[PDB]
Every structure is written in structure tokens, then in C-alpha cells.
Amino acid sequence: MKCIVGLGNIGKRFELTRHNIGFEVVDYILEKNNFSLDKQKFKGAYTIERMNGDKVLFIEPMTMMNLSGEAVAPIMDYYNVNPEDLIVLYDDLDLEQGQVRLRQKGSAGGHNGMKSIIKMLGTDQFKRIRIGVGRPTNGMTVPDYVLQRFSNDEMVTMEKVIEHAARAIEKFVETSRFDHVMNEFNGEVKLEHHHHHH
Template structure:
């Protein structure tokens, strides 16, 4: 079984913020496939469904972003999911808005949600989709920037990115060759 995790912060005030783009992709997958996060355990909302004929565990941690590993680690242990079958979707300041970068493994790159997952799993050997949100301008602090909602214009771009990322997830689930999925989906979304 593959495990797909979208990172974000819980609560109304964080909905549609830059930091919650991982949740947005999971929500897109849920809605387009008529799934619901109908279970809660270990501080995570999740469901187990068939996507592209494959069994998949979809998770949104119900922790704050920086504690995401507290939900992901125990759920993966409970369902006996190997880290090699994990794919995490999250925002990335170091990529321009509209860019998507899939990676087989790697460091947290300064992302506290990823640091938490790596710490709880004891490895960084899992797949990820980094979704570019760009860096703040005009002297805005990083925390203020990532907790800011997308503008209407930005949301037009990000809706395409969300759909693109969701298709990458679907292709990954049905195609075990992640390198092929990387080749297809890495880059700027237009």
C-alpha cells in the first residue's frame, strides 16, 4: 500500500494559505475521486481507498505543520507502510510559484513539517512533491508569508499546480516507476 500525505496546518484560519498547499492537493484528490477522510487515529485524518486500482492511504495530519511526523509515523507503523511507499506533498519557498519538483528522497531543506516526518521515520528516503510558493518580497517575514492566503491571481496559477500535482500522485500510485513520473511532472506548470 502506498501512503500519500499532504502537509498543512489545521483550522479555518489556515485554509487556502501558502503553507497548506499539501492539504489542497489531498482535498483535490478526495473530491475528484469522491473519497472522504473518514477515519481519525494518531492525530491524523485519513482514508484508505483504491486509486488507479491500487490501495492507498491518504493522510492529512491533524497536528500543526511542525509536528506532522507525530501523525505520519504512527499511521505508517500501524498500517505497516514502508517509507519507500510514502509520498509527501508540501510547500517550498525555494521554488518559484508555479514550479513543481518531485524527488525520490532528500533533506528537509528547512521545512519543519518535513523535519518532523524525517525525525519520526528515522529516514529521509521517501518520495516528495515540492510545490513552489516563492519567497516573500517587500521585507515580509517568512512566517507571515507562508500563512498568507493566495491572491486571486495567484490562486489561478495554483489551481493548475494543484491539479498537476494530483495527476502526478495518481500516476505514481498506478506506475511504480517514480523516475518516469518525475520526468513527466517536474517543472513549471502552465
């Protein structure tokens, strides 16, 4: 059983904020397959659903971002999930909008949700998809930038990114070949260009 975790903050005022890009990808996968986070446990919203004939566990922590691991770790323990079978979706400041990086393991790169998970699991040996959200270029602090809503201009690219990352998850659940998923999905989505842009 794979465990797909979307990182983010609960509440209507955090909807579509840059720091909730993980939630948005999981929300898209759930709506596309007509699933919902119908259970709750250890402050984590989750569901267990069959998808291509395979049971998959989805989790959105209801802790806040900085405390994400205190839902994820015990829900994984309860359902005996190895870190091998975990994939975490989250926002990356050091990638540009349009970019995604899929990795087998490694550091949080200073992202507080990933740090809470590493601390609670006691390892960084789990899969992740870093989703580019860009840096602030106009003197916003990082906290204010990640807790701000995506503009409609940003969403022209980010809608497609969400679709691209959902497909990466969907392909990983079907095949269980992560390296093959990395090769197909690492990169950028095709940017939307009109004739008049040239």
C-alpha cells in the first residue's frame, strides 16, 4: 500500500495558497477518481481507496504545516506503511513555477512540513515530489509569500503543474516503478504561449 501525503494548512483562508500546493494535488486526484477524505485519525484526514485495483492511502494532515509529522507518522504506523512506500507532495521555493522534481530520498531543504515528517519518522529515506512555486521578487518575506493565494496569472501554469503531478502519482500507483516515473515526469510542464508572445 502506497501512502500519498499532501502537505498544507487546514482552513478556508489557506485555500490555494502557495504552501498548500501539496493539498491541491491530492484534492485533484481525489475529485478525478470521485474519492474523499472521509476518515480522520491522529489529526490527519485520510482515505483508503482502490485505484487501478490497488489500495492506496491518502493523507492531508490537519495539524498545521510545521507539525505535519505528528499525523503522518502514527497513521503510517497504524497501517504498517514503510517509508519506502511514502510519497510526499510539497511546495519548493527554489524551483520555478512549472518545474517539478521527483526524488527517492533526502533533505527537507528547509521546508518545515518535510522537517516534521523526517523528525517523526526518524528518516529522510522516503519519496517526494517537490513542486516549484518560485521565490518572491518584490520584498515579501517568505512566510507571507507562501501563505498568500496564487494569482490567476500564476494558476495558468500551476493548473497544468497540478495535472502533471497527479499523473505522476497515478503512474506510480499503477506501476510501482518510481525510477521509471522519475524519468517520465522530472522536468517542466509545457508553458502556455500564444502567437502574440513572439
